[PDB]
Design a protein around this ligand. Sequence first.
Ligand SMILES: Nc1nc2c(ncn2[C@@H]2O[C@H](COP(=O)(O)OP(=O)(O)OP(=O)(O)O)[C@@H](O)[C@H]2O)c(=O)[nH]1
Ligand SMILES: O=C(Nc1cccc(Nc2cc(Nc3cccc(C(F)F)c3)ncn2)c1)C1CC1
Ligand SMILES: Nc1nc2c(ncn2[C@@H]2O[C@H](COP(=O)(O)OP(=O)(O)O)[C@@H](O)[C@H]2O)c(=O)[nH]1
Ligand SMILES: [Ca+2]
Ligand SMILES: [Cl-]
Ligand SMILES: [Mg+2]
Ligand SMILES: [Mg+2]
Lengths: 54, 424, 437, 346
Amino acid sequence: MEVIELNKCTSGQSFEVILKPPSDPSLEEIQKKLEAAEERRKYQEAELLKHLAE
Amino acid sequence: REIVHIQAGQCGNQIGAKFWEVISDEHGIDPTGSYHGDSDLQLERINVYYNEATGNKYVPRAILVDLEPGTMDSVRSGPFGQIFRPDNFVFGQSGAGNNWAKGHYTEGAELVDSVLDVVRKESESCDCLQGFQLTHSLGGGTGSGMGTLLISKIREEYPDRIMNTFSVMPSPKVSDTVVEPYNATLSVHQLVENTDETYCIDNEALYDICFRTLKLTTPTYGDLNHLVSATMSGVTTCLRFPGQLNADLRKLAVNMVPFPRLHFFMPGFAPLTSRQYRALTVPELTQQMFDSKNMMAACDPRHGRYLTVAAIFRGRMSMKEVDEQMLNVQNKNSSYFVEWIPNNVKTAVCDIPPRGLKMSATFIGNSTAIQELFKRISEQFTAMFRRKAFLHWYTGEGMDEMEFTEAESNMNDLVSEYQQYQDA
Amino acid sequence: MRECISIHVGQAGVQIGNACWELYCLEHGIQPDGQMPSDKTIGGGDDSFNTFFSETGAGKHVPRAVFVDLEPTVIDEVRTGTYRQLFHPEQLITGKEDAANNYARGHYTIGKEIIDLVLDRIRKLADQCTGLQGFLVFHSFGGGTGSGFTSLLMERLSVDYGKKSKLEFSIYPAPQVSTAVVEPYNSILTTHTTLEHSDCAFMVDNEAIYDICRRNLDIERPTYTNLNRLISQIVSSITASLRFDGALNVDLTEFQTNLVPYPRIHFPLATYAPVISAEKAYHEQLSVAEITNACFEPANQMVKCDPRHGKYMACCLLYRGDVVPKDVNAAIATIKTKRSIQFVDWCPTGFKVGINYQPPTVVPGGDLAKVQRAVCMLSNTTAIAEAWARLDHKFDLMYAKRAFVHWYVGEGMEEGEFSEAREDMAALEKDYEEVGV
Amino acid sequence: MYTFVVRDENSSVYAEVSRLLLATGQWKRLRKDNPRFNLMLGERNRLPFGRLGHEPGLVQLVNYYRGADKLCRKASLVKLIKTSPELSESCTWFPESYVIYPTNTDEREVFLAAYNRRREGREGNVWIAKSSEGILISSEASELLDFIDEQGQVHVIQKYLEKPLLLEPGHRKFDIRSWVLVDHLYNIYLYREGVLRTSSEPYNSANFQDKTCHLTNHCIQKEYSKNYGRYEEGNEMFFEEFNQYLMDALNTTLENSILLQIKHIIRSCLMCIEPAISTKHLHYQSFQLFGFDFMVDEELKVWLIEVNGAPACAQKLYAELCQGIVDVAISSVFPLATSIFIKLHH
Ligand SMILES: Nc1nc2c(ncn2[C@@H]2O[C@H](COP(=O)(O)OP(=O)(O)OP(=O)(O)O)[C@@H](O)[C@H]2O)c(=O)[nH]1
Ligand SMILES: O=C(Nc1cccc(Nc2cc(Nc3cccc(C(F)F)c3)ncn2)c1)C1CC1
Ligand SMILES: Nc1nc2c(ncn2[C@@H]2O[C@H](COP(=O)(O)OP(=O)(O)O)[C@@H](O)[C@H]2O)c(=O)[nH]1
Ligand SMILES: [Ca+2]
Ligand SMILES: [Cl-]
Ligand SMILES: [Mg+2]
Ligand SMILES: [Mg+2]
């Protein structure tokens, strides 16, 4: 159980204890998706309004 | 923020006027529209239902609709009648004679655009209109036929705002005319399609409560409307007062309605008050609010499963005890809540109690037992429709038998839908 | 000195940000109006606290923070509260209507129309940075804003800041304190959409914080105020190494390096001790051994689970107060003999240890007692995947019935995003199991 | 009223427990996938322990110890005994055993370095192979490893007890089965009534392929054996007959000759894994019933051979043993409106 990379300073100290050794899409690609769901939305609203017109 | 309230027809206007009396009392506003309570909590969310007019006077965001002037003259002459903006009274002269067609297709059609003009004037003066509420019966003509006509107009013009109805279902034990099952069937079809929540207030249930447990021998429409206005206060109390839940319309809609068409709610109130002084304990309140006998739709909760439940407690009480008692209900009757919606019973609290109670509870169940209500209507409907009885009052206004056949089919479809989930 | 920017999204993110910044001001002796008398470099600096604050000419110390909600009511309480002067109006961004507990509403519908204002305010903070290292993002899994707008934000931040680190502080859904039934949908959705844009996420299960507030603080019905002051203790414990002099976890890169060897298994478990009620009449202060041993009690974890049935991949110990290495070493040695701590074969069995001699700061009139030494263990154990199982299972039960899906599809989402996110989650669960059994 | 759930219908014991629990009138059974339970009588495989203890307002107890399989699978157990200091390689009561993987860590190069010293010292040298059907008892290695490698599972090979205690009249082998219940508090409860699963053929020390002498299993004894049922009903002698026979033929009792060693072995194994499986400070609780299998040799030394995590009871004893499970494992956690167990502690 050996203690390594001991650093000390006035605020504290830090170290390591080793007990045993080892045995993204683009901006266009996102604007595309956002506006495509906006198209699905505007279609659903159109279906609603055509149905209300019937 | 703002809600727009509409009340259509006789029943619609009577229960709506009682609603406004009740919540006006709660917010400390007198029949002239002036504030006079103690707490500032009474005014913090006052604009959800009241417009602030010159003089710091508060005017309900309410539109009053009828096809005959009787009930609304009665309202203007009544206890809080002068609180309502007089422009907001919109009436024709000829009535609708308990006729859904006259409400939807002919007379109501002639009055509907002026009602919409007032709705628009009220809406454009809102910062953040969250939606609408309608009080109406489904058994008469103005309420059902012109109310659902309005509802689809409003949906066309405001497709993205919430639509809630408080809807009085007809029972033969409390019945005006024999064509109520027809008027209600036509209406349910509209309601299944164009509202976000519908509070199913069966008139049978109101009568039974008045009779059995309130020992009222011969209940008036008043005795029934008192129950309704107390219940509506309870379900809007979180919208109207500040608390740990910033309560709005859409969030309740999204959480209560797993399937778009299955949005018909069993409401209930506790303790059931008349027109005693014993104090209730939190387990007592909780047991009553889930009691079939405290619910305003005449369905047996034990004959279905709760899809979702909203419990609302009012008054000062221990949150720990409320939480324990809610948990004991769900855990001791877990068969009756669908397991495929985990933790489907949500509890809110409002610190301010209603008038004359220190503690009370309001229940909103989206249970499959509601199918019973629709079965009843449907039986009553078919009993006349298989003989085409009374149809002339409608075909003489333009309607076809085909439209009746369709509404019957769609309500049977709604019944099958509720059954599907009762066995899933 | 390399700056860190905190983004607080949605109600939970905003209120937890409030707690954390209140705590930071106390810890660095910064008053509510932003003056730091201890700072002698007026109007500038590259000290370690400047990672989290900037300075103005008047000597005003200003959080490198942005708050975002799709509705005004919460950030309005920021704009009027004890620390109103602290933040600059442009940092507090609100909408008009929120995402109504709908992931789709925050990601697609209401998000799209605010993402650019948010990115521009973030850029105005970044342009004040000499060497920005990345972002600490605070949000709930359950809310609509917290899930959908956070994942939108996360995507755009990867694009506009590809070389910077992003760390999450996540609030995982607990029914006791939840007001919505669709939180499992929102959780799974956002976990899937954020998984490749997050370098390390610290999950906090409200269930665990709630029960810690009940048992160890003797509060019968914990409020968000209680939960948030305890959460901010933990969060300060985790970020002190960025805000103070030290040699352990000094930049966001080191959190990934020390805690995340496999970038998909990037959910370290926090355990914290001691949580002691300020109303406790007589309290015997706990020793280095007692609190390090408490670190291996699940009752002290931010997520209830069982590290004994799983494997560790990394373990950091962060102390605050009267601690010195030989005590820590003795405590570790004796704990290893009495506890089940197994590492993955391809990792060293060991602990990276950080001590800060200043004991924890406590908010005056809070629920937490002052103690002379405290510790936050950060362990990347595969046992945390228990939470995922729970969440996934709840999700499966609703989605079998398409319950509530219409609400999401009606905002533009397609049904297939649901089972895309669930299949990502299933891959995640199987990663954890292959690492850990 | 309490609520419980069943997720293993092929469990004889917990079937009877469900029955008794219902007859109490204070326990009601929910459907298998209802989460709002107090007691989960779970499945044997992939019991979802990560979903227990997260239901507010409910105390959850489960009839299995997560992690107990380390004791209840043969290779698991051999690795546990050799690596646990509490037990030790030099274990005086577990037969010399080695874990061997198929051709397709392993111990056969460790195995040979002891095997051939057994052959050279001119000692008896019979070994038996088994994996958690398929048994080889042989005198030279190239049969054992050959056979292990025909299969495809991890295996263990164990010193086959060539000089077992033999029951007369019959000159026949037997094994001891003890039922132990560990409650949430990690009380260890050894059940008063164990059983002898006996052979009915005279132990043949010559050719180790006559399965009926060497294998005490209840099924291999009912099917292929000559005299199934000659001496005792069901190849099942119980503890009073065994005490009496030890008294008469050997001038000892069951307690002193065998039971002290059984209690020591049970308590040692359970206490060994206690820090790894105990639910003392957990958000859910565990109990479990285990079956321990022992072999007494001619010198009256007790050997442990397997622990079984889902045991079947003896049909004479189901009633009493399941009632005891209810009394001390269930009603201890969920109280209702001269004990049959001995607590092991030292
Ligand atoms: N610990 C903690 N949890 C919170 C807090 N506020 C909300 N939550 C949890 O967060 C989830 C709800 O998400 P919110 O943050 O309120 O939702 P939102 O991001 O504002 O999104 P909207 O749906 O648009 O209002 C639930 O699981 C709540 O219990 C908080 O202040 N502290
Ligand atoms: O809207 C009406 N009643 C009403 C009553 C209570 C709350 C809200 N609004 C919410 C509800 C919410 N979650 C929530 C989900 C399910 C159950 C509950 C339960 F606590 F009630 C709360 N979150 C924000 N706002 C609205 C009447 C039509 C007029
Ligand atoms: N609960 C209640 N029900 C009413 C009231 N008035 C009428 N009804 C019911 O409403 C139906 C008649 O509807 P009504 O409102 O008079 O029709 P409208 O004026 O044409 O809309 C019948 O089923 C009556 O039972 C009332 O004041 N309270
Ligand atoms: Ca400075
Ligand atoms: Cl970059
Ligand atoms: Mg009438
Ligand atoms: Mg919000």
